[PDB]
Scaffold this active site. Structure first.
Site, PDB file in Angstrom:
ATOM      1  N   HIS A  53       0.809  -1.225   0.000  1.00  0.00           N
ATOM      2  CA  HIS A  53       0.000   0.000   0.000  1.00  0.00           C
ATOM      3  C   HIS A  53       0.848   1.285   0.000  1.00  0.00           C
ATOM      4  CE1 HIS A  53      -0.171  -0.343   4.550  1.00  0.00           C
ATOM      5  NE2 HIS A  53       0.135   0.945   4.439  1.00  0.00           N
ATOM      6  N   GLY A 109       1.841   5.679   9.930  1.00  0.00           N
ATOM      7  CA  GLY A 109       3.274   5.647   9.666  1.00  0.00           C
ATOM      8  C   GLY A 109       3.948   4.390  10.203  1.00  0.00           C
ATOM      9  N   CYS A 148       3.153   1.361   9.556  1.00  0.00           N
ATOM     10  CA  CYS A 148       3.127   0.328   8.515  1.00  0.00           C
ATOM     11  C   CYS A 148       4.519  -0.064   8.096  1.00  0.00           C
ATOM     12  CB  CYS A 148       2.284   0.773   7.327  1.00  0.00           C
ATOM     13  SG  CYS A 148       0.589   1.231   7.773  1.00  0.00           S
TER      14      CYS A 148
HETATM   15  O1  LIG Z   1      -6.267   4.849   8.054  1.00  0.00           O
HETATM   16  C1  LIG Z   1      -5.789   4.090   7.210  1.00  0.00           C
HETATM   17  C2  LIG Z   1      -4.372   4.242   6.722  1.00  0.00           C
HETATM   18  C3  LIG Z   1      -3.673   2.873   6.641  1.00  0.00           C
HETATM   19  O2  LIG Z   1      -2.397   3.074   6.043  1.00  0.00           O
HETATM   20  C4  LIG Z   1      -3.598   2.303   8.103  1.00  0.00           C
HETATM   21  O3  LIG Z   1      -4.586   1.821   8.642  1.00  0.00           O
HETATM   22  N1  LIG Z   1      -2.403   2.305   8.722  1.00  0.00           N
HETATM   23  C5  LIG Z   1      -2.080   2.386  10.090  1.00  0.00           C
HETATM   24  C6  LIG Z   1      -1.412   1.321  10.682  1.00  0.00           C
HETATM   25  N2  LIG Z   1      -1.473   0.982  11.975  1.00  0.00           N
HETATM   26  C7  LIG Z   1      -2.179   1.762  12.776  1.00  0.00           C
HETATM   27  C8  LIG Z   1      -2.851   2.932  12.353  1.00  0.00           C
HETATM   28  C9  LIG Z   1      -3.495   3.817  13.251  1.00  0.00           C
HETATM   29  C10 LIG Z   1      -4.056   4.976  12.801  1.00  0.00           C
HETATM   30  C11 LIG Z   1      -4.015   5.305  11.455  1.00  0.00           C
HETATM   31  C12 LIG Z   1      -3.415   4.473  10.552  1.00  0.00           C
HETATM   32  C13 LIG Z   1      -2.811   3.256  10.967  1.00  0.00           C
HETATM   33  C14 LIG Z   1      -4.535   1.924   5.812  1.00  0.00           C
HETATM   34  C15 LIG Z   1      -3.985   0.871   5.086  1.00  0.00           C
HETATM   35  C16 LIG Z   1      -4.810  -0.147   4.650  1.00  0.00           C
HETATM   36 CL1  LIG Z   1      -4.103  -1.514   3.837  1.00  0.00          CL
HETATM   37  C17 LIG Z   1      -6.172  -0.123   4.863  1.00  0.00           C
HETATM   38  C18 LIG Z   1      -6.735   0.952   5.525  1.00  0.00           C
HETATM   39  C19 LIG Z   1      -5.922   1.978   6.006  1.00  0.00           C
HETATM   40  N3  LIG Z   1      -6.477   3.024   6.749  1.00  0.00           N
END
Ligand SMILES: O=C1C[C@@](O)(C(=O)Nc2cncc3ccccc23)c2cc(Cl)ccc2N1
Ligand SMILES: O=C1C[C@@](O)(C(=O)Nc2cncc3ccccc23)c2cc(Cl)ccc2N1
Lengths: 304, 304
Positions: free
Chosen positions: B41, B143, B145
């Protein structure tokens, strides 16, 4: 989101861990620049530990009796000195992995990461708090002596604790990096009383703010209190009295959540008087006091 | 003595963390040999995440669009490929800090350490379990990820998890290092149901053995049970059914404490039916399921 008992990354400290042997005793040492720091009880035998005369015991020892091994290479000891309850072994090689560092004496209620070590090898990392009574509730076995507690601010490691012993009660005692014990403890195999411990009130309030930030809000009530009223309750439940200094440190969390500190105190007051009723806060069925207001902001904002 | 939620020392993994930028998205990458692994992603924009066609999105990208920074030095990307939900960026420099490593897919109920990172910089380390429903209850912000989960066996790092997302429910989802999600999850900003989670019964029993080893023995009773009777209770309390395989893995702890596994099951049965009555076990007011039988033996024996 999510709230975990997070330790600092241990890499900078792992590069400092060495094994120190003197006679038949082996424990951990911390190699910074050309100096290895370790508990002075490394020079003792089992009969010595009951009432050791460290000055006399150290006199029978020479530089060559201190075997310092960094990984698998031997370090050459060119000097030895006792500073309070630690030995400083001057080695002829400066640790090439010495991070930027400070020796700091933490206050009770503050938190730090411990890198548990055996035979100079890191085995695990965990976060803990210096209890108000100056003990730590660690996880340490025989050989763990010399393991250190630290905090990391960007690239600087502030060492605050060196492990020395386990009291008959199972709690842990140790020194700052200048060899000064935290608490009334002495490095002797004798029964030693740790004082009455209390709950770190400012930390529990910080953890209640972390729960609010993370969606756990069931405990919030329509009540408020005063510092004096709250402290009457804190006294009854063996909680540290809350001061305006604690309220001021909770400022950032009060601003982020929009919940005044005295309103969170009222929530805590009801939790103390009525319990959790079988509910949980951040996955815990008791009130957590091992996260400072700084820890909560750091974790909830992702400071690297 | 003492029992802590201990993570592995994170040093070997910190040396692998890099920052990966593609367009306006920056996340963490894992640099092993001449390859950087990161969530696929990283190639998405906010509008793309609702329903991304990763094959099409990756086609619009060239090697030069992937900015990989290790510390403060830039790495040169000479190849790019998608493997399931991860991108493998071939770089022209092999990481000089690459530890001995394996990519392993863990089973639910197993535990691992997470090194939470932001902008390729490690910020904290914590221990967690892969839930029976294949989620992890982590601590991750935007961030994070690309942060990884791992285990360490002497000098070998077994990577088992790469963080991808936070579900609307606050739990975390991710992949093994081959890009295969644990669970039914897909890398899309869509509502995704994690299954009904259960308590890891073998882990709770292991933690009860750790409590016995550490002096907390109040919960031990004059009762015993059968696997069938215990499982009727486990079913009622959303606990994973105990099998002879779990009993066999508890063998070492049963031998160390001298408490037969079915006797510990009877203790657990009473704890489930009657609660803790306001008491604690190892400082916890609920039954802990994030320590495997291997974790308990390791911590209780000091394996470095
Ligand atoms: O909000 C999003 C961005 C995203 O990169 C993500 O969830 N990353 C984060 C990863 N871990 C915790 C987090 C906490 C607070 C915000 C972000 C987080 C994202 C990636 C995918 Cl594959 C699907 C939905 C999303 N939705
Ligand atoms: O038993 C001892 C040995 C001693 O080196 C120690 O406690 N170390 C250990 C340190 N931490 C945890 C442990 C757990 C289990 C056994 C040992 C532990 C020791 C040192 C002093 Cl200054 C005083 C008493 C003692 N009594």
């Amino acid at each position: 989101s999510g709230f975990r008992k997070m330790a600092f990354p241990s890499g900078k400290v792992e590069g400092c861990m060495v094994q120190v042997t003197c006679g038949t005793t082996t424990l951990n040492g911390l190699w910074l620049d050309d100096v290895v720091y370790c508990p002075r009880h490394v020079i003792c035998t089992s009969e010595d530990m009951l009432n050791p005369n460290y000055e006399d015991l150290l006199i029978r020892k020479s530089n060559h009796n201190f075997l310092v091994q960094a990984g698998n290479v031997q370090l050459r000891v060119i000097g030895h000195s006792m500073q309070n309850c630690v030995l400083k072994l001057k080695v002829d090689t400066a640790n090439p992995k010495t991070p930027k560092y400070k020796f700091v004496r933490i206050q009770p209620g503050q938190t730090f990461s411990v890198l548990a070590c055996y035979n100079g090898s890191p085995s695990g990392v965990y976060q803990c708090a210096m209890r108000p009574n100056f003990t730590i509730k660690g996880s340490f076995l025989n050989g763990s002596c010399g393991s250190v507690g630290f905090n990391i601010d960007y690239d600087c490691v502030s060492f605050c604790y060196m492990h020395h012993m386990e009291l008959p009660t199972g709690v842990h005692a140790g020194t700052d990096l200048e060899g000064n014990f935290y608490g009334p403890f002495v490095d002797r195999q004798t029964a030693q009383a740790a004082g009455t411990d209390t709950t770190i009130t400012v930390n529990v309030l910080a953890w209640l703010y972390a729960a609010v930030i993370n969606g756990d809000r069931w405990f919030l009530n329509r009540f408020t209190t005063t510092l004096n009223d709250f402290n009457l309750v804190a006294m009854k439940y063996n909680y540290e009295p809350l001061t305006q200094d604690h309220v001021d440190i909770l400022g950032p969390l009060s601003a982020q959540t929009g919940i005044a500190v005295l309103d969170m105190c009222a929530s805590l007051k009801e939790l103390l008087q009525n319990g959790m009723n079988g509910r949980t806060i951040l996955g815990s069925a008791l009130l957590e006091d091992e996260f400072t207001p700084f820890d909560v902001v750091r974790q909830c904002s992702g400071v690297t």
